[PDB]
């Protein structure tokens, strides 16, 4: 069986902010919050992923206040807290879930200082997390059908001849959002779950389920809540339409992040 | 007879190359062992000899044909057949030396090179690094003919080593990485030849370490960062499997889940 390590790491999420023990106070019950990612050895942003499914900062446990949607997440002594309230699973699609409650770690607002909570899982941007020491999103070109490049043009998105154009650069944030490099307040967005809905660029404000994406091992870019993938409509770039569409795997649904 | 997958450079397209690489992956591993959504090749421990290898038959415009043999446990080329002669890289140990005796049994001439099939020795024998050996349909065509004529006295050793470097990347590495496969599809799509950029080189160099970091990660988070390179020289670190899911398609087996 493989060794299970215990790496110390930051947890980056909504709008690229870091999971933070507020004001560096480790009193039992002090809230966990979003905060700009530090670049030092401060303990309140460095988390040990322990073998017992515990996530620890300065020796104390990331702990949910309860098992109902909307209760806050605190720091608490690992031995004193209810054991089930200290246990978490980090899923490969960016979800951090509390197994006992089946509720998911969330930042229901995007501002610095937002109190973290547990919410019902809807695979929204507000519930996307990444354990990493990288505090900057990865900027990349996204190549797709016929080797053409995903291109941002204000609200509209389409695929067009690649040319090393800031309109063709994309910031992959730790919360699962895909942001145009020129304006990181905005997000690749599907306004809804319906098949053939046109994907566009809108504000990352709502941090919705339509704004969260995962690059799958099969080359598709998946919207987790709907289960639909990005698709160059009719496999015709001239339509200038990128849509949500059920998975069929043909070349108009294959993408590659060329970093 | 071991499973055979065929590819021809004659009229090769993006699609025909994709079908080929997909087919190779389907015979390299069953796909039932998946760690963090990334397939794992079979464990060498427990793998019977009659399932140890797969065959990749390459042909070109001149209808020269050559058959590479791939170890399914690491997707790497261990040797090749051309006509009624077969050649093999110097095996690392005695068991791999025994295992290749089960390849191309019908062939009347069998030879083991004094050199292994690692890039470092192939590069010095070719007189050039991967960073300058162009890849694409054209180079694959020429690599096929050079491999074919090595039985004849017509292929000098550097050209042979260069042909190995071409086939290994365009077949084995593309099987290991969707990223490298997409790089090959870029060359085929535009009928261009191009040396691989540093991102491809570092991915090839890191494949073993990446497999270990992923399979021994704590829920995807690595114990230590792995340093990769962008397409320009720029270096960055990876701490989590999430960015590698669309990058790596196969891993060498390291340990049990």
């Amino acid at each position, epitope marked *: 069986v493989c060794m299970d390590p215990e790496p110390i790491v930051r947890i980056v999420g909504r709008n690229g902010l870091c999971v933070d023990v507020r004001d560096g106070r480790f009193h039992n019950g002090n809230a966990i919050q979003l905060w700009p990612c530090k670049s030092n050895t401060d303990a309140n942003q460095l988390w040990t992923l322990k073998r017992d499914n515990t996530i620890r900062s300065n020796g104390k446990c990331l702990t949910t206040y309860g098992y109902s949607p909307g209760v806050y997440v605190m720091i608490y002594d690992c031995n004193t807290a209810a054991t089930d309230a200290t246990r978490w699973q980090i899923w490969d699609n960016g979800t951090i879930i509390n197994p006992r409650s089946s509720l998911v770690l969330a930042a229901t607002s995007g501002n610095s200082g937002t109190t973290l909570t547990v919410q019902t899982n809807i695979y929204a941007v507000s519930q996307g997390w990444l354990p990493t020491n990288n505090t900057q999103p990865f900027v990349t070109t996204i190549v797709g059908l*016929y080797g053409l490049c995903l291109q941002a043009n204000s609200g509209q998105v389409w695929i067009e*001849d690649c040319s090393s154009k800031a309109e063709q650069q994309w910031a992959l944030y730790a919360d699962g959002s895909i942001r145009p490099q020129q304006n990181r307040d905005n997000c690749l967005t599907s306004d809804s779950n319906i098949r053939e809905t046109v994907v566009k660029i809108l504000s990352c404000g709502p941090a919705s389920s339509g704004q969260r994406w995962m690059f799958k091992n099969d080359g598709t870019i998946l919207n987790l809540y709907s289960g639909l993938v990005l698709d160059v409509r*009719a496999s*015709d770039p001239s339509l200038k339409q990128i849509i949500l*569409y059920p998975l069929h795997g043909d070349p108009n649904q294959i993408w590659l992040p060329l970093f | 007879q071991y499973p055979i997958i065929n590819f021809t450079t004659a009229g090769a397209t993006v699609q025909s190359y994709t079908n080929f690489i997909r087919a190779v992956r389907g015979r390299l591993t069953t796909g039932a062992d998946v760690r963090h959504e990334i397939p794992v090749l079979p464990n060498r421990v427990g793998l019977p000899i009659n399932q140890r290898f797969i065959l990749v038959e390459l042909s070109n415009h001149a209808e020269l044909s050559v058959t590479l043999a791939l170890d399914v446990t690491n997707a790497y080329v261990v040797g090749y057949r051309a006509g009624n002669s077969a050649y093999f890289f110097h095996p690392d140990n005695q068991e791999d030396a025994e295992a290749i005796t089960h390849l191309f049994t019908d062939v009347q001439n069998r030879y083991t090179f004094a050199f292994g099939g690692n890039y470092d020795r192939l590069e010095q024998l070719a007189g050039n690094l991967r960073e300058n050996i162009e890849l694409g349909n054209g180079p694959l065509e020429e690599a096929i003919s050079a491999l074919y004529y090595y039985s004849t006295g017509g292929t000098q050793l550097p050209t042979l080593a260069r042909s190995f470097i071409i086939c290994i990347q365009m077949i084995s590495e593309a099987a290991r990485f969707q990223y490298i496969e997409g790089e090959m599809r870029t060359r085929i799509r535009y009928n261009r030849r191009s040396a691989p950029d540093p991102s491809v080189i570092t991915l090839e160099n890191s494949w073993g370490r990446l497999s270990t970091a992923i399979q021994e990660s704590n829920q995807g988070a690595f114990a230590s960062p792995i340093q990769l390179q962008r397409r320009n020289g720029s270096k960055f670190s990876v701490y989590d499997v999430s960015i590698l899911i669309p990058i790596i398609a196969l891993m060498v087996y390291r340990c049990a889940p």
Partner: nanobody, 109 residues
Framework: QLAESGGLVQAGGSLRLSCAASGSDYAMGWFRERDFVAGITSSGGGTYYADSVKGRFTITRDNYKNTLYLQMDSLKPEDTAVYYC???????????????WGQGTLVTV
């Protein structure tokens, strides 16, 4: 290369258009300015219809015969136009990909 065929009938009728290709690698679509009507991916498996014609038109393909179809049921005077076949492919151009058209077939309803 692509050539159309099968292009008059009253409102509410039926007509099937064919599209014979010379050379499966190609996504194919129908157009009728030129406007998108229907499209299908190379292997099939993805069919995408314009909103106007959805629920009335059926695009199909058959890559062992190299022919593309457009079934047009419940036609209206709104469908009267020149109907072109179109294909998109992987090669090099100013687009960055290939676009081959047809010569067009007239339909009047």
């Amino acid at each position: 290369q692509l050539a159309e065929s099968g292009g008059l009938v009253q409102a509410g009728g039926s007509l099937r258009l064919s599209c014979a290709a010379s050379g499966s690698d190609y996504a194919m679509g129908w157009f009728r300015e030129r406007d998108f009507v229907a499209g299908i991916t190379s292997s099939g498996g993805g069919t995408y219809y314009a909103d106007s014609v959805k629920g009335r038109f059926t695009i199909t393909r058959d890559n062992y015969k190299n022919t593309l179809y457009l079934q047009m049921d419940s036609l209206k005077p709104e469908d009267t136009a020149v109907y072109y076949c179109k294909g998109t492919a992987d090669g090099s151009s100013s687009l960055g990909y290939l676009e081959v058209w047809g010569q067009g077939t007239l339909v009047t309803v």
